[PDB]
């Protein structure tokens, strides 16, 4: 049933692609488990990150990018639709100008493009969460 975590999969995205994730956190929100979703430019995990999506369950969500190994301006968001100990559905909708990240099919965060999504060659899901499904649309 469970998908290996860290999960690393080759993928290429464009305007219209939707990334579907279905999993559950491994800890209660008080202990602050994290969830991180990184869009890499190569299959090697050390490659640059076009879209960095790291959740601190129960406190906040921050997004950033890594360009030539350098972290850029981090964007902070306090919207926390995630529910303690409950399964989540994560969908990231790719738009021409930005990303549209929905939580359980409900829009929660957006992140304007810093690197055009055509440079993405790998998508990695890794942090203190259980993983059940991973889909590329």
């Amino acid at each position: 049933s469970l998908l290996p975590v860290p999960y690393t999969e080759a993928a290429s995205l464009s305007t219209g692609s939707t990334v579907t994730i279905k999993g559950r956190p491994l800890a209660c929100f008080l202990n602050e488990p994290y969830l991180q979703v990184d869009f890499h430019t190569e299959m090697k995990e050390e490659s640059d990150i076009v879209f960095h999506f790291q959740v601190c369950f129960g406190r906040r969500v921050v997004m950033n990018s890594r360009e030539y190994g350098a972290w850029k301006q981090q964007v902070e968001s306090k919207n926390m639709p995630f529910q303690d100990g409950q399964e989540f559905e994560l969908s990231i909708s790719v738009l021409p100008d930005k990303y549209q990240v929905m939580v359980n099919g409900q829009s929660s965060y957006t992140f304007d493009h810093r690197i055009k999504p055509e440079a993405v060659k790998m998508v990695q899901v890794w942090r203190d969460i259980s993983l059940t499904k991973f889909n590329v649309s």
Partner: antibody
Amino acid sequence: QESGPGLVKPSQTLSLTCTVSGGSITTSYYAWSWIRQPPGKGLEWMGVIASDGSTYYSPSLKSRTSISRDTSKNQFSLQLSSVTPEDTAVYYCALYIRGSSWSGWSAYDYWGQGTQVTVSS
Amino acid sequence: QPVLNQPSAVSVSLGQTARITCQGGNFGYYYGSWYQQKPGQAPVLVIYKDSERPSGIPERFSGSSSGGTATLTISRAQAEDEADYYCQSADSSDNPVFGGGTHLTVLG
């Protein structure tokens, strides 16, 4: 509308300001950047100040560049410290229109007319 | 200092199609833009996001991009296209770059 022209002796610090619209309607006054052009040379970026974000600078000029803004005056001002004869250039004020956030590859539709700054002894 | 590499001067006869390349720069990752500058006049944006042109710019202007190079295409040259053309991109989201500048001469 740009103002603040003049010649300056090396090692001094001169200021340049950009006025509210200069021909731009219904402006949320978003994403102001500084681009300079050494005489006969190509354009050389200096910095930017976004409404969504805060500010960015160029490493070469990071130490010597200061950008301020007075929204009540709806102007934002440059201060380039420790000027040298290389800083002689035409300084432009460029406005970023696109409603998306400011990025490096972003373009500026409305450019200020520019003013010549001459740095020599 | 980081500068894009582009030819200094390119000549085209009236009625021909002109192409200006912006090489040595960081593309694929980023987007590309183009400005037209007249002597003693402020630069004017010609191309943004490598494909689209702003309002007022004729359909004669088009842009291409691939790998680490971008190519500006002027399909039907006229006299007013005699100017300096600058390409622009970034080394990173927080750092734009500008090209060395190309002087285009419209012959004929």
